[PDB]
Amino acid sequence: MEVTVPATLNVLNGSDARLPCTFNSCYTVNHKQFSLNWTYQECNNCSEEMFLQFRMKIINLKLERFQDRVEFSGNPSKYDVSVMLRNVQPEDEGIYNCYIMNPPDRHRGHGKIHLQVLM
Amino acid sequence: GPQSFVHFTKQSLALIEQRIAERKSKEPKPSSDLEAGKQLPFIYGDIPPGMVSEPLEDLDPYYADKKTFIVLNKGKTIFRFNATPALYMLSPFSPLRRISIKILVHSLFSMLIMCTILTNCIFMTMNNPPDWTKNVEYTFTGIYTFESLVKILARGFCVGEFTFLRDPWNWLDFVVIVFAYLTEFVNNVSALRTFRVLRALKTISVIPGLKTIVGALIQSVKKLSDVMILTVFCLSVFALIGLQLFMGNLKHKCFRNSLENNETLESIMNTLESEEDFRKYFYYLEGSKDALLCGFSTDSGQCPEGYTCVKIGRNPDYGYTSFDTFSWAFLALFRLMTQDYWENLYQQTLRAAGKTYMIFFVVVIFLGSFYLINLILAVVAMAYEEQNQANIEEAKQPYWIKFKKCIYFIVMDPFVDLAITICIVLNTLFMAMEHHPMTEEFKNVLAIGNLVFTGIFAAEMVLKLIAMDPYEYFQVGWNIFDSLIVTLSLVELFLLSVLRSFRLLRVFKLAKSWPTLNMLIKIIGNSVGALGNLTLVLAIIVFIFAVVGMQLFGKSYKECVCKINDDCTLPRWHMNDFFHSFLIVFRVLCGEWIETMWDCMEVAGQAMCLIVYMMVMVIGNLVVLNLFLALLLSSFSSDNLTAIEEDPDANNLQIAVTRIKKGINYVKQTLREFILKAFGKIWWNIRKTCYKIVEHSWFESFIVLMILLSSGALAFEDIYIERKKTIKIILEYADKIFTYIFILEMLLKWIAYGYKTYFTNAWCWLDFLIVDVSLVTLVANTLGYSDLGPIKSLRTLRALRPLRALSRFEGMRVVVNALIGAIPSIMNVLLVCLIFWLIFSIMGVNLFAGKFYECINTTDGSRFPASQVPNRSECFALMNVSQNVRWKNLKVNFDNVGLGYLSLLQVATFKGWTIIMYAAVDSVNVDKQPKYEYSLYMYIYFVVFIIFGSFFTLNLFIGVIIDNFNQQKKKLGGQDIFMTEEQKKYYNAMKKLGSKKPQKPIPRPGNKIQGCIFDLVTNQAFDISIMVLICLNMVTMMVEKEGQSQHMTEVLYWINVVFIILFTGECVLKLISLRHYYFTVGWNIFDFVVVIISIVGMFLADLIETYFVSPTLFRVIRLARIGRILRLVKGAKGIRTLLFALMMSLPALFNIGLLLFLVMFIYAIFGMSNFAYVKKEDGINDMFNFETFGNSMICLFQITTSAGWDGLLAPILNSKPPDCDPKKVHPGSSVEGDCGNPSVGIFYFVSYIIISFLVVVNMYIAVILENFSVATE
Amino acid sequence: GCVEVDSETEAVYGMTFKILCISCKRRSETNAETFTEWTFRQKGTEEFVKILRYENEVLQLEEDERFEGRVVWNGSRGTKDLQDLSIFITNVTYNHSGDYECHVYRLLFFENYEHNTSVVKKIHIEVVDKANRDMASIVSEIMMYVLIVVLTIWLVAEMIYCYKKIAAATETA
Ligand SMILES: CC(C)CCC[C@@H](C)[C@H]1CC[C@H]2[C@@H]3CC=C4C[C@@H](OC(=O)CCC(=O)O)CC[C@]4(C)[C@H]3CC[C@]12C
Ligand SMILES: CC(C)CCC[C@@H](C)[C@H]1CC[C@H]2[C@@H]3CC=C4C[C@@H](OC(=O)CCC(=O)O)CC[C@]4(C)[C@H]3CC[C@]12C
Ligand SMILES: Nc1nnc(-c2cccc(Cl)c2Cl)c(N)n1
Ligand SMILES: *[C@@H]1O[C@H](CO)[C@@H](O)[C@H](O)[C@H]1NC(C)=O
Ligand SMILES: *[C@@H]1O[C@H](CO)[C@@H](O)[C@H](O)[C@H]1NC(C)=O
Ligand SMILES: *[C@@H]1O[C@H](CO)[C@@H](O)[C@H](O)[C@H]1NC(C)=O
């Protein structure tokens, strides 16, 4: 299971950030079986906050720290699971993690993005 | 003259300059014996010390006008260089140039390059390499670039002739180096790694002798153009026929009758994705990946009750087995022609369409699958014989001496060799007495016997080494061989199974006194002797293909593994690593390429897998067939040169038997001497009239008709005869009348001929035996003993009644005479095969005796994982708890030598070998549960056996049989041995059609418009236009597919009608132009017939699809369109000759097929008699069994090609519970039990496949070969 | 395997008789649970009357004077997947002549599917006092004998004619 994510993503304050998380699993993405776990952590050792997931439909938990600024921007049927984010605040700087499981695959992938807010 | 060795100097350059000036003012052939890469002519003698590896004058006077020079190498080889400065910068008189020339000409340079390439080919065989191999690949790139640099410095890059780029292999070297540097700096990784395999092809360049072999192979492949064109055309025609007949038929499935929630077939099919979901709506057999196929006809497959047949879903085998499109039909027809897993397609098509469609498969198998392969073999054979003839023509153009002498007297006596040969035979027979359930005392006696035998051989070795010194002992290859065997035996005694089987090679010492067993040694030695380069090229090609397949598809096989295996584990055959890639390539060469190609496609794409597999098939089979034919022709032709007299120094065995017979004569004479000292005119007319009646055509015809009727009455005794009581009674009384008729005929022949004339005749003996069996059966039935054991068993011999037609039919009697003549050589080669296979059988017993047992779940047939139930004791402990557990064994295994023979036969024929190989590689030990691929490298045993037995043993078999046929033909006086005297006249008249000169041209008519049309129609432009129109019509017929729109169907119909109009118009033009001269040409009247058939077929199909409902009749009638595309033969001279060869070989093939049909009929009757009630397992199912004459003939035609005979024999090997039920009750019959007879089944199937091999392969090859030479002549 | 043989149609008075009813499945590898019921319409009557039922290896005879103590099971034994559903009359009388029906109730067990089907087989039984010979057997024997005699007569005629011709030619020579 191969997951392609940028190690560092630098965006300007007040701009929109698209978090590129992609994979190349051999089997077709069965929406009845696909599992997504998007988590955010302020640091590598910090705990992860569960905020976005796919079980059967894109479900956004709408955390207070993200408000209504988090939506889905990829497509599982074409192997893009990217997450968009409007008007990136300086507080949005941190580490974003995408975890993907795509049955009947056995290996479980993990993509990590460090989002940086520029002045 | 040796003074011509002058150095290349400035005066030489000035002379070349003045000569080029004269050449410019001027505004032949170079010497072949002086050409570069060869040795100097012997006239030049030895090289003086001062001129080796130095610029010399061009020794060829041809190049006296050009700036070219010669550098001579130690070892007497000549390299032709260029005197033009390299790169326009470095003159030939330069230190760099001289050093580079010396380096290039040195042999250590070539040795280093060969070692480098062979080392890199080892690192190529790593699926994932360690991180430190980057340094090694950098070292390899550095060595390669240094070699290329020294070549460029020595001979210039691309400046004039004799430069670096002028050699085609230097192109490959340059491409390799640029690819390496590009992938190192600029950077698909898999494609670059697959390009790294190109560094293996440099073995051809650096190893001497391989370049010529590759060139010869390419020249041979240039000779197959006509055969390839004909093969493609025939496959296209058969694919179009199959597309017309079976389009969409493999999408039939059994669908549920009762549906809930208002759901319909479309609604269900729009939601299902998984096989578990499909299994709830379609009927699947247990442990199957595809839904059961059904049919709408009476003879097709039957759905269960509550299921109905419908055309929906996907085709079987991942969707790859179908006739839905021309491409898939072409793939299926290529598979049929190569006969690779063709029985599965046979059974699938029969189940889906009907059993009357076996005619298509009969025609295909006996017209393409055999004739095209034999044509390919014949053409390659002639290419090799022309190459060999050209090669031959060019070649033509104090106290110790007492003991020494005493032991020389003792051990060199001829009787000693006879005693040693007897000991060898006894030791082999003693080793062949090993089985799995062997008691301790038997093991002890075997060990003691083997110890005694190795002691005897060692004592003989010591006696022979003290009789003469080692300097004379070690001078003979036989003594070296025996020395190796004895020392290995001693090593094993001091210390395995393998070393125990090593002593078995001593059986080859009988080759001295066995002329036929020496042929096997000659073939094997040639394979690594004269043809060692061909074998090496084959090995290099196989290595390259294995590496390429691994590099391309190994990662895919591991990522997409759940697409091809339910457990998400790698299958048995994959390409994830080098050994399994090589196994796949070797299996393809064996001839199994479709089952692995399906998984290849599933994981890594149709285009890539198809390209790679087709390349492997074509190139590997070309090289393997070339090696096979080279071995055959070399060993059976070049060995016949009368080198040495027949045993000039008589062998010790011959001297021993001569002394033995002399002593026998002496003893007989002495004993005879000792015992003698101690002590009516009307009867002749009766015989004459009996002879007149018997020898009459009316009598012969009546008896032949009776034979046919009595033979045909045997086919009605199905298992369904209890429903036909009138037919039963009629057939009983018919049996009585037939017995009376034949008894009367035999009495008449007795009185007509005389007892001596009758009984010195094999045909009369056969008739007498058959009528005696019939009379005994009739008498026993009359006396009431109709069920007395052996008397009841004697009734199955009624299947031999058809054997009375061999003497009646001249074509069958003609073929049987050839078989009888060839019998002795068949026995010889069969004995050699048995002796050779005994070694492998004993080795297989020693390796796998008793290790094929396993503990299975009977419900699923799945082996328990060895973590639980690791041995048979735990298997029994689990059986005491569960109820569906069993400690099972393979039915065909290596438990003794007898069963090892059957295992070896199944492996050598490639039918059922995979089960044995899986068991062998899983085997752990005795009373131990097998583990998956625990003994992985047991595949090497089967690879080595397949090579040595199946390839060399088949080479020997074919060589001996064709030699016997040639000797028979020479004995007859150059007369065809497969044709009757009446057929010879037809053949002679028919042979004259290939040499008639063109007749006078048709005169122009009188009418002006008629003459103008004549000039229009007699034109090459007209002929070419007609040919391209035929090609376009063929394309429009190829375009048509399954599920096409009604619009496309209508436009295709209109296009075809337009083509019909065009061809009819051209026929009318030719008719009105040529008047009545048109019908004087066979091709012209063939075109006329085709035009009429096309018009009639179109009208009839339109009628049958409008005023009638009959899709099958419509499909069959629509086959008349193939006539419009069969006309491409007219303008194709290359394939017309091959078709004429086929037409020339038809009369003998007819007789061969007649005999084959008689044998198949007899075997079918025997099969219905014996195996009609065996359990439905493996290859015996509801549709392919021995319950009916039609079913039996279908199965027998299937196994005539040796396909699925393992799967048909497997249900018959059951003889005891819980495999079978001896007291099973069959409703509607009095027969009890569903068990088989293992001995009868083994004899039946082995004998049938041997007969099929001896007829349908060997006579087919001989007939096709001779008639292809004739058609070619 | 299973072959659907039809029953005989003539039973002799005072002896034993077996009434055949074989019903095979379309596919022999499928599982089923089968039971049967036999009805009987005596000649001279118009109504079919149930006489027995067999299920789960127990035969249940209805209270019928004509068949009490005369019918035993003669079909497939030891299983619930009945394919031979024959009965056996141990003492034939004149009350056993009429039309019989063999109702077969088969319940196939498929994957997530059960099919409850039914078959009916009709057997007409006529009782006699003496067992008649088969017309097919009679005509077959007659034709075999006439064929034997015709062939022998033809051969003897040809032998006599050829012998006389050969003797005449020889004595002329
Ligand atoms: C040269 C070729 C033609 C073979 C010549 C004969 C012998 C070299 C071999 C071939 C087959 C062998 C036989 C094959 C099988 C058996 C059965 C085996 O006994 C069993 O089957 C034991 C089974 C049990 O104990 O349960 C004893 C050896 C024997 C007779 C073998 C004895 C030696 C034979 C005759
Ligand atoms: C030329 C003649 C004399 C022999 C022709 C056959 C050989 C190619 C065979 C016979 C013995 C075989 C060997 C016998 C034993 C083994 C051990 C086997 O491994 C095991 O048994 C399991 C080891 C483990 O995992 O612990 C792997 C194959 C190998 C090397 C075999 C390789 C192939 C051999 C050499
Ligand atoms: N090596 C090998 N040799 N011969 C055969 C063979 C056997 C019987 C019939 C046929 Cl037609 C073949 Cl080709 C085979 N299946 N495999
Ligand atoms: C078909 O649909 C109707 C409602 O439209 C429903 O009442 C009915 O139960 C359905 N059919 C069955 C037999 O389930
Ligand atoms: C086998 O099973 C029976 C019944 O459960 C049990 O009584 C007996 O002890 C078992 N015997 C062995 C040898 O396991
Ligand atoms: C049938 O029953 C009658 C009356 O009981 C008896 O006379 C006759 O012998 C019986 N037949 C048989 C076959 O027992």
C128-to-B51, B250, B726, C95, C134 alpha-carbon distances in Å:
124, 55, 22, 11, 14
For C19, list phi and psi in degrees, rounded to 5.
-100, 115
Which of B1145, B1002, B1123 has the alpha carbon at shortest distance from B1059?
B1123
Q: Are A37 and A53 in contact (CB under 8 A)?
A: yes
A109 beta partners: A100
Dist CA B208 CA B205 (whole Å):
7
Chains touching chain C, criterion 3+ CB pairs below 8 Å: B
For A8, list phi and psi in degrees, rounded to 5.
-130, 130
Q: Tell whether ligand 1 has an atom less than 6 A from the beta carbon of residue B432.
A: yes
Q: Tell whether ligand 1 has an atom less than 6 A from the beta carbon of residue B839.
A: no
In A1-119, the DSSP E strands lie at 3-4, 8-12, 17-19, 22-23, 35-41, 49-54, 58-60, 70-72, 83-85, 94-101, 109-118
Dist CA B59 CA B43 (whole Å):
12
Nearest residue of chain A to residue B558 (CA atoms): A26
B974, burial (CB in 10 Å: exposed 0-12, middle 13-18, buried 19+): exposed
Breaks (C-N over 2.5 A) in chain C follow: none
**Cβ neighbours for B272, distance < 8 A, ≥ 6 positions apart:** B278, B281
Residues in chain A: 119
Method: cryo-EM
Nearest residue of chain C to residue B1229 (CA atoms): C3
Dist CA B448 CA B474 (whole Å):
30
Is there a contact between A104 and B560 if contact means CB atoms under 8 Å apart? no
Give the rounded distance of the alpha carbon of B60 from its chain centre. 50
- Closest Cα in chain A, distance from residue B563 (Å): 8
**Cβ neighbours for B78, distance < 8 A, ≥ 6 positions apart:** B34, B35, B36, B37, B38, B39, B40, B59, B70, B72
Q: Which residue, chain included where needed, has tokens 């780029």?
A: B165
Q: Give me B813's structure tokens.
A: 């009697």
Dist CA C128 CA B1002 (whole Å):
87
With left for phi above 0 and alpha for psi between -120 and 50, is residue B124 left, alpha or beta? Answer: alpha
Which of B204, B955, B211 has the alpha carbon at shortest distance from B524?
B955
Dist CA B1153 CA B1156 (whole Å):
5
Give the DSSP H or E segment for C42. Answer: strand C31-42
- Angle CA C34–C39–C44, to nearest 5: 165
How many whole angstroms from B936 Cα to the centroid of ligand 2?
9
C158 touches chain B (CB under 8 A): yes
Q: Whose atoms come closest to the Cα of B851: which ligand?
A: 2
Tell me if the domain spanning A1-119 has CATH number 2.60.40.10.
yes
Q: Are B66 and B28 in contact (CB under 8 A)?
A: no
A104 closest CB neighbour out of B273, B556, B562: B562
Q: Whose atoms come closest to the Cα of C11: which ligand?
A: 6
Which of C85, C31, C30 has the alpha carbon at shortest distance from C57?
C85
Dist CA B462 CA B456 (whole Å):
10
B755, burial (CB in 10 Å: exposed 0-12, middle 13-18, buried 19+): exposed
Q: Give me B327's structure tokens.
A: 């491409």
The DSSP call for residue A38 is E
Residues in chain B: 1273
CB atoms within 10 A of CB B48: 10
Burial B667-689 (b: 16+ CB within 10 A, else e): eeeeeeeeeeeeeeeeeebeebb
Nearest residue of chain B to residue A24 (CA atoms): B559
Q: Give me B646's structure tokens.
A: 């027949």
Q: Are B842 and B900 in contact (CB under 8 A)?
A: yes
Three-state SS at A53 = strand
Nearest residue of chain B to residue C85 (CA atoms): B1227
| Chain B residues closer than 8 Å to A26 by CB | 556, 559-560, 563, 603
Q: Are B437 and B896 in contact (CB under 8 A)?
A: no
B189 touches chain A (CB under 8 A): no
For B640, list phi and psi in degrees, rounded to 5.
-95, 85
How many whole angstroms from B630 Cα to the centroid of ligand 3?
20
Q: Tell whether ligand 1 has an atom less than 6 A from the beta carbon of residue B438.
A: no
Dist CA C33 CA C80 (whole Å):
5
**Cβ neighbours for B63, distance < 8 A, ≥ 6 positions apart:** B30
Q: Are B768 and B774 in contact (CB under 8 A)?
A: no
Q: Give me C51's structure tokens.
A: 């006489």
Q: Which residue, chain included where needed, has tokens 């390409």?
A: B575
B560 touches chain A (CB under 8 A): yes
CB atoms within 10 A of CB B253: 25
Three-state SS at B79 = strand
Nearest residue of chain B to residue C168 (CA atoms): B685
Pairing between β-strand A35-41 and β-strand A49-54 as defined by DSSP bridges: antiparallel
Dist CA B409 CA B464 (whole Å):
11
C115 beta partners: C108
Dist CA B237 CA B240 (whole Å):
5
Q: Whose atoms come closest to the Cα of B488: which ligand?
A: 2
Q: Are B794 and B773 in contact (CB under 8 A)?
A: yes
| Chain B residues closer than 8 Å to A27 by CB | 560, 562-563
Q: What is the dihedral of CA B761, B764, B770, B776, to 10 degrees?
A: -100
Dist CA B1052 CA B243 (whole Å):
15
Interface test with B, best of C23, C162, C165, C172 (most B CBs within 10 A): C162
- Closest Cα in chain A, distance from residue B276 (Å): 15
Q: Are C75 and C85 in contact (CB under 8 A)?
A: yes
- Give me the domain span that covers residue C162: 1-173
B279 closest CB neighbour out of C5, C108, C111: C111
Q: Are B488 and B505 in contact (CB under 8 A)?
A: no
Q: Do at least 3 CB pairs under 8 Å connect C with A?
A: no
**Cβ neighbours for B765, distance < 8 A, ≥ 6 positions apart:** B759
The domain ranges of chain A are 1-119
Q: What is the dihedral of CA B1249, B340, B1190, B771, to 10 degrees?
A: -10
Which of A75, A76, A35 has the alpha carbon at shortest distance from A54?
A35
Sign of CA dihedral C70, C76, C80, C81: negative
Give the rounded distance of the alpha carbon of B618 from its chain centre. 14
Which residues surround ligand 4 with Cβ inside 6 Å? B 260-262
Q: Which among B258, B261, B267 is the best mutation to test ligand 4's pocket, defined by most ligand atoms within 8 Å of the CB?
A: B261
Give the rounded distance of the alpha carbon of B265 from its chain centre. 46
Strand order of the β-sheet with C31-42 is C10-12, C113-128, C98-110, C31-42, C49-55, C58-61
Which of B1040, A66, A43, B846 has the alpha carbon at shortest distance from A52?
A66
DSSP C74-112: -S--S-SS-SB--EEESS--GGG-EEEEEEEEEEEEETT
Is there a contact between A26 and B568 if contact means CB atoms under 8 Å apart? no
B310 beta partners: B253
Q: Tell whether ligand 1 has an atom less than 6 A from the beta carbon of residue B838.
A: yes
Q: Crossing angle, helix B810-848 and helix B897-908, to 10 degrees? A: 120
Pairing between β-strand B77-80 and β-strand B69-73 as defined by DSSP bridges: antiparallel
User: Which amino acid, one-letter code, is at B353?
Assistant: A
C45 touches chain B (CB under 8 A): no
